[PDB]
């Protein structure tokens, strides 16, 4: 018996925190305490506890690597390069980078979710270009174990969280992903795919840029199944 525990929190109408845990009932309360304690300041928080019907367990298997650069132009140049090692045409990879740096939300600011980009044509397939699509209903099978292991190998808690999210994306049929943070202080981003692994890349923006986002590279012929998988299928990831 599994329960999905989803938390989001706002402050001054702005989203400041959000997380999901999928656990056995005997750790339900523990998961709720953790997420309730997650944001520092908030004026509104919602928590959803949902009994899980079906779910799938999947074995994590991406290679991790790390790269440092001396300007965002050089980090984005490398980012485009790694993307074309997943068979993506260079101009498609470049338009992704172009969209994130110039503001992915057409009415200014960050999106509430990821761009779905046609691998072949670079065109944005998400219907709501302010909202995008959100990957949800994923968690590490044994998050306590995974967090301690990755911390001691030198990865941060943001790495722990982003890894589980990409791996679901790739399992759901996203070919490749580009991501850097919306938070102007954090400036590591990544690029991922089944062949290039999980590729951490610093810095993909200047420390002070408030723009970020994610671009998912998807084959249009699979768009409907991909969206269903990202947003509805329940996946536990086993390290
Ligand atoms: C937050 C999360 C748990 C979704 O929870 P949810 O309660 O089911 O959210 P809902 O779909 O019901 O959203 C309803 C409202 O809360 C929104 N909201 C939810 N998640 C949001 C997010 N990640 N960013 C901005 N707004 C968000 C509000 O925008 C509004 O959604 P709307 O755009 O559809 O109008 C999801 O983002 C998640 O799985 N996060 C874990 C991974 C992660 O964020 N890692 C960060 C480091 S990579
Ligand atoms: N669950 C999600 N699925 C897809 N995209 C997201 C999700 N959460 C955030 N994003 C996008 O990725 C950017 C970075 O988010 P974060 O990982 O929370 O810093 C955000 O500005 C959103 O545009």
Q: Helix and strand layout, with pairings?
A:
Blueprint: E1 2-11, E2 14-24, H1 28-36, E3 44-51, E4 56-59, E5 64-68, H2 72-84, H3 90-101, E6 115-118, E7 138-140, H4 143-152, H5 157-172, E8 176-180, E9 189-193, E10 197-202, E11 213-218, H6 223-232, E12 235-238
Parallel strand pairs: 4-12, 5-10, 6-11, 7-12
Antiparallel strand pairs: 1-2, 1-3, 8-9, 8-11, 9-10
Residues 110-111, 113-114, 134-136, 181-182, 212-214 line the site of adenosine monophosphate.
Catalytic activity: heptanedioate + ATP + CoA = 6-carboxyhexanoyl-CoA + AMP + diphosphate
Keywords: ATP-binding, Biotin biosynthesis, Ligase, Magnesium, Nucleotide-binding
EC number: 6.2.1.14
- The geometry reads as globular
Order of helices and strands: EEHEEEHHEEHHEEEEHE
Largest sheet: 6 strands, mixed
Task: Write down how many β-strands occur, each being a DSSP E stretch of 2 or more residues.
Answer: 12
Q: Any ligands, ions or cofactors bound here, and which?
A: coenzyme A, adenosine monophosphate
Oligomer: monomer
Global Rg: 17 Å
Q: Beta fraction of the residues?
A: 25-35%
* Structure annotation, total helices: 6
Pfam families: BioW
EC number: 6.2.1.14
Keywords: ATP-binding, Biotin biosynthesis, Ligase, Magnesium, Nucleotide-binding
Catalytic activity: heptanedioate + ATP + CoA = 6-carboxyhexanoyl-CoA + AMP + diphosphate
């Amino acid at each position: 018996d599994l329960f999905s525990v989803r938390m989001r929190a706002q402050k001054n109408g702005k989203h400041v925190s959000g997380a999901e845990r999928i656990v056995k009932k005997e750790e339900l309360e523990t998961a709720v305490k953790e997420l309730l304690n997650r944001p520092k300041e908030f004026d509104f928080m919602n928590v959803k506890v949902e009994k899980v019907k079906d779910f799938e367990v999947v074995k994590f298997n991406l290679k991790i690597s790390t790269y440092s650069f001396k300007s965002p132009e050089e980090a984005r140049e490398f980012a485009v390069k790694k993307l074309t090692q997943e068979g993506i045409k260079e101009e498609v990879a470049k338009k992704a980078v172009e969209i994130l740096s110039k503001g992915a939300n057409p009415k200014g600011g960050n999106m509430r979710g990821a761009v779905l980009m046609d691998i072949e044509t670079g065109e944005r397939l998400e219907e709501d270009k302010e909202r995008g699509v959100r990957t949800i209903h994923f968690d590490w099978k044994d998050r306590k174990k995974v967090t301690e292991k990755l911390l001691k190998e030198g990865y941060t808690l943001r790495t722990v969280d982003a890894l589980a999210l990409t791996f679901k994306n790739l399992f759901c049929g996203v070919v490749a992903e580009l991501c850097w943070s919306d938070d102007p202080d954090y400036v590591t981003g990544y690029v991922s795919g089944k062949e290039i692994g999980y590729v951490r890349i610093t810095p993909l923006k200047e420390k002070g840029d408030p723009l970020g986002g994610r671009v998912y590279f998807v084959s249009r012929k699979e768009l409907s199944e991909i969206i269903e998988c990202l947003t509805q299928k329940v996946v536990l990831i086993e390290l």
